[PDB]
Copies of this chain bind each other. A is one copy, B any other.
């Protein structure tokens, strides 16, 4: 069973060593007539408490942003960050779950951050460092903090961020692996590779107590 996670906005999930704050909740709204959709992706902040393998671990010692929204969301992102006491210049790592325009629209706000966009990792300045991310080999960012390969939606190189040890248990920031709570009958049409995405969805639901989907509010996973 799953229930949308209600509570004070922005949704803050305290934890140790990492807290998670959903800065902007995603949406995807159809229109009264025609087939257009107004949408934007969720943006999540992972906050540490108060070759490529080592660089990732170092870049994760500061604020980590998971997705950035579309370009139109720039002022709202800046405001949300400020609300958490974080200047754009303070962000040390940006993770882009996949390369769609409503998820990676504001990378340029963070020229001082390391960037992990899908499976490509670079230091600030565009020095790309190879690594071995795969479905059987997650990337360790820190204690109880990992990047998973969760292919399917955007293609074979989508990633998710898994945050263990919060007050609500394990939070998975899943990109569009999940569209929203109750997307059981809608996600397949949006998917590049439904078979892969199904494997990824099942994998996430084994570990997650909370899922932050790409286009809706976070939800709890019950057992």
Contacts and interface: CB of A to CB of B under 8 A. Distances in A.
A149 to B, nearest CB: 13
Number of copies: 2
Interface of A: 34-40, 51, 70-74, 96, 98-102, 104-111, 115, 117-118, 120, 122, 124-130, 154-157, 192
| Chain A interface, >50% SS class | loop
Given A70-B115, A70-B126, A100-B117, 10 more contacts: A36-B127, A36-B130, A38-B126, A71-B109, A71-B111, A101-B115, A101-B120, A102-B122, A107-B108, A155-B192
Contacts of A36: 51, 127-130
A151 B108 CA distance: 26
A220 B201 CA distance: 46
B40 A126 contact: yes
